[PDB]
Amino acid sequence: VKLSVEPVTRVEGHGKISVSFDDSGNLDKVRFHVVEVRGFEKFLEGRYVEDAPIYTPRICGICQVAHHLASAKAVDNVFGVKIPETAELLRNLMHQGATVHSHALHFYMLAAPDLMFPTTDDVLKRNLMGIAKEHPEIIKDAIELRKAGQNVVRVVGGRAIHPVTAVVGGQSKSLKEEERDELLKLSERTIELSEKSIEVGKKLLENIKDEDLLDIGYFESAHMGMVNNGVHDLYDGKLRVVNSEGKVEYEFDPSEYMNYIAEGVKPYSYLKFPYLKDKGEEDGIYRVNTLSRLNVSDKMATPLAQKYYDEFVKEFGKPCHHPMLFHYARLIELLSSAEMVKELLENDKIVGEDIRAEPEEVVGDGVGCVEAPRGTLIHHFKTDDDGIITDTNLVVATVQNNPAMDIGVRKVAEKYIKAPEDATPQVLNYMEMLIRAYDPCLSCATH
Amino acid sequence: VKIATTWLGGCSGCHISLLDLHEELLNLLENVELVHCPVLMDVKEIPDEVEVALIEGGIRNEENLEIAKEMRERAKIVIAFGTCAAFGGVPGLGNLYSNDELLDKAYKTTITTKNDDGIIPNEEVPELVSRVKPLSEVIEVDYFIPGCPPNPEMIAEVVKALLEGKEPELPKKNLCEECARKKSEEGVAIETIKRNYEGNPDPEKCLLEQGYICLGIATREGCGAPCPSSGVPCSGCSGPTDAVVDQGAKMISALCSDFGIDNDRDVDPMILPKSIKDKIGSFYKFTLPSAFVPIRLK
Amino acid sequence: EWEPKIIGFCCNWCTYGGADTAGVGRMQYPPSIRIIRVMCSGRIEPSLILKAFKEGADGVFVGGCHLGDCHYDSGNYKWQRRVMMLYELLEELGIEKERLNHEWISASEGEKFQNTMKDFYNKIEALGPCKLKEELDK
Ligand code: NFU
Ligand code: SF4
Ligand code: SF4
Numbered sequence A: 001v002k003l004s005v006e007p008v009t010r011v012e013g014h015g016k017i018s019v020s021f022d023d024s025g026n027l028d029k030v031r032f033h034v035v036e037v038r039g040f041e042k043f044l045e046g047r048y049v050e051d052a053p054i055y056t057p058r059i060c061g062i063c064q065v066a067h068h069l070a071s072a073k074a075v076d077n078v079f080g081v082k083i084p085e086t087a088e089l090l091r092n093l094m095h096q097g098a099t100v101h102s103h104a105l106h107f108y109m110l111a112a113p114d115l116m117f118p119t120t121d122d123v124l125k126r127n128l129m130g131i132a133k134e135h136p137e138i139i140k141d142a143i144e145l146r147k148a149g150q151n152v153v154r155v156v157g158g159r160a161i162h163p164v165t166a167v168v169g170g171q172s173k174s175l176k177e178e179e180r181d182e183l184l185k186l187s188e189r190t191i192e193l194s195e196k197s198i199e200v201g202k203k204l205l206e207n208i209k210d211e212d213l214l215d216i217g218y219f220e221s222a223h224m225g226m227v228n229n230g231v232h233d234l235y236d237g238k239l240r241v242v243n244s245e246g247k248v249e250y251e252f253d254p255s256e257y258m259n260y261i262a263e264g265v266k267p268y269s270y271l272k273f274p275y276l277k278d279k280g281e282e283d284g285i286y287r288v289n290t291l292s293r294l295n296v297s298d299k300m301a302t303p304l305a306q307k308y309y310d311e312f313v314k315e316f317g318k319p320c321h322h323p324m325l326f327h328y329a330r331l332i333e334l335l336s337s338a339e340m341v342k343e344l345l346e347n348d349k350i351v352g353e354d355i356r357a358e359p360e361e362v363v364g365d366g367v368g369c370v371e372a373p374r375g376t377l378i379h380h381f382k383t384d385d386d387g388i389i390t391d392t393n394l395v396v397a398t399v400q401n402n403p404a405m406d407i408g409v410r411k412v413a414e415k416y417i418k419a420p421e422d423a424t425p426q427v428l429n430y431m432e433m434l435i436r437a438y439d440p441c442l443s444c445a446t447h
Numbered sequence B: 001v002k003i004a005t006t007w008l009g010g011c012s013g014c015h016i017s018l019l020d021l022h023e024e025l026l027n028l029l030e031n032v033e034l035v036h037c038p039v040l041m042d043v044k045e046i047p048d049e050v051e052v053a054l055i056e057g058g059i060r061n062e063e064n065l066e067i068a069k070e071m072r073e074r075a076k077i078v079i080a081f082g083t084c085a086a087f088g089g090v091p092g093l094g095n096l097y098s099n100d101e102l103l104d105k106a107y108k109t110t111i112t113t114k115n116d117d118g119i120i121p122n123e124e125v126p127e128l129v130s131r132v133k134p135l136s137e138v139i140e141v142d143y144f145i146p147g148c149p150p151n152p153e154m155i156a157e158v159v160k161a162l163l164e165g166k167e168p169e170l171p172k173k174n175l176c177e178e179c180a181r182k183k184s185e186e187g188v189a190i191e192t193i194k195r196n197y198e199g200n201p202d203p204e205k206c207l208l209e210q211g212y213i214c215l216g217i218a219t220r221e222g223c224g225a226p227c228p229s230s231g232v233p234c235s236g237c238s239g240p241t242d243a244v245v246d247q248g249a250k251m252i253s254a255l256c257s258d259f260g261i262d263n264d265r266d267v268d269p270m271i272l273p274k275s276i277k278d279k280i281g282s283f284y285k286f287t288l289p290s291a292f293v294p295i296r297l298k
Numbered sequence C: 001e002w003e004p005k006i007i008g009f010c011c012n013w014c015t016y017g018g019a020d021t022a023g024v025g026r027m028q029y030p031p032s033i034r035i036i037r038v039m040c041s042g043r044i045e046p047s048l049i050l051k052a053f054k055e056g057a058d059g060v061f062v063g064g065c066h067l068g069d070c071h072y073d074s075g076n077y078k079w080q081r082r083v084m085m086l087y088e089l090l091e092e093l094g095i096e097k098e099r100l101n102h103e104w105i106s107a108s109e110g111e112k113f114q115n116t117m118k119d120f121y122n123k124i125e126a127l128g129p130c131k132l133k134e135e136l137d138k
């Protein structure tokens, strides 16, 4: 007997789960398959390097900002140019605004329906419309957070989806004093709603704990995230890896990523299976984003976020390997980004006019790295003397949680399915809940 | 009114633009009956009796083709949702290489990739179709919402008109109408061609008259021209007007026509092809699959 | 077993007259070409040539007045800038530059037209069929 969950819903992209049983009727093979691929790495060859920040955002419509900036950075390295401070701040402001929208989007519109209705049969209730029908205040807040984040992206990036200001040597436009004032005034409400969101999560994760669903897909792995002097940072710093026990294994510059990360290929999925090269396919499994970043970080960069992180760390320890608590860490990050949007808007250099540095001679190698809302994002481009791309490599966030998602779904089935009858609609949804915990973006991950 | 959405060879950006209606999304969802939408709900199969269907993305794999055909049979009105569905979009650049070259890079020759036996995922995953194709090449499409992604207001305007029974009408003019940049009354004249990083562009003068390849002249209005207003040329993401089949071809025609028009009879006709080192990427970023020659012969 | 499919675009004042003069003089040339009449070569733009390849053209020919002799003064100068970019665009698309041929032929030059048709036919016949339509029909 062979069962298939397709398509996996309330996730970005094309994914599916297969569950096979042997002749006796016992659980046999459970796998997570990604059924999409566009081949951006190859078709970027022959393109203008300065046009990479125009093509990569099209890898994904949720985290397009992350790609725009990762490409911009790599491109700024291809040209031996160091961008001005005001440009670094505008880019980061766009990055934080984008993270608020992405985290709010996932928690409220993709994850919350399961956290609110974990044991329902009514499939039509498990969605933002069902949540809005009984708790409209929750969906209204999600929308207000998303709108605030996208507003920041639109103002600083030119477009709410697929921004265009991160150009070679910096930004194509400056933030005007009036624009800055309007955004800073709106920033306080984004922090309030982000704080409120953490509580909605506490309540809903308590409901998950009551149904013995907080340990679904559990397994221990390494964790990777960007840190700036050991402090949590989504825009700059070095990449840190902690082991399953919390010991710092590596700390390296994103440009040396090829010496630490490797991506395996399995025949049943268009999604690769990354691992730490030194440790291997099984001992080198690591996770990225939200909890993985909290785990590697010494502390948060903002004060309100730090308080919830402190409270979480004392209750669940370090490192926390619970897939379902990724939801919680996501809420702490939703708050830190909201706090950062305000912080950056309060920095007088944001409205500066020294937004661009003149491009220098072309160096045919450039690496761009940023922590996308779903994990470490690395864009690596190689070009000719003309600045035409000759080779590229993209290690995109969610690809690094594919091993976790494939192990996790197996572990849910091992916990709830012995025979095919056990695979009820609610049990099958438990498998998709483990997937959703990692906030996957399958278009992103495959590129 | 039973409405449904699906996504193919795109990026979800059109779906996110629909969500960028924000407070208005709830007003829309109270009027319509959403029966299938992978991103927002768990209804796995496309149900029968769908009045309106929004299909995002172009045709990239065998499964995209099956879904498109299925949605066409279940829906009364099919809408090519966004530039990918309508013209093919950015993934369409994959047409410059063979499907084997796209897959060999991603699963074999990328620097970080470790593939011992050298296999391409082929189990439980669909095969790629020969070339990326706009939705209209495989199924009959009734209407389309251009844009990468289409603006939220435009999506609402189109959906609203269909719920009312009215026929949706898209803007007809090219982008310079909406662009706030100043044009020379004497007409356009291009002296040299610059890559976007070359020089420092004037914020008031039309970028095309400044030597940058701006696609606004060959691109449909509606977006509000955020790119030229932000300091970068238009990349032609909304696609061509209703009177232009091949956007890239018309853009090249216009560009070649005005290049050195003030010295029309003596200007060297080889400066332009020698200057543009990536022609397809300069004129077919978002529309290669809908072009007369939508692939590269190998 | 296979004969090239060639489409032509000739201006009404010169090449179309040049082509007629070849006929008046019974100047035999291969029957692959089919000419489309336009008033000036300035009417010719990339989309007309790209549309022809899409339809299955093995070769595309364009004929206009000699540079400086355009009935409309400078129509051919614009077409000349358009065709040079088009040659390179075709190479980028995998279409041999040789599959496109542009020439300046006056109305009295029937012999030149005959020879241009002979030479172009041989060129395309040697290259074999352009496999674009077959690739698209998959
Ligand atoms: N967040 C995010 Fe992307 Ni749609 C993913 N996964 C990018 O780097
Ligand atoms: S048209 Fe643009 S935004 Fe929409 S699916 Fe395609 S790439 Fe994404
Ligand atoms: S900058 Fe672009 S859209 Fe604006 S007027 Fe010039 S060509 Fe038109």
Ligand code: SF4
Pocket: B148, B216, B219, B220, B223, B224, B225, B226, B227, B228, B233, B234, B235, B236, B237, B238, B239
């Ligand atoms: S200005 Fe051009 S590239 Fe920018 S959003 Fe409008 S159509 Fe797209």
Ligand code: FES
Pocket: C011, C012, C013, C014, C015, C039, C040, C041, C042, C064, C065, C066, C070, C071, C072, C073, C074, C075, C076
């Ligand atoms: S009339 Fe023959 S080229 Fe203009």
Ligand SMILES: [Fe+3]
Pocket: A041, A393, A394, A395, A396, A446, A447, B106, B110
């Ligand atoms: Fe990759």
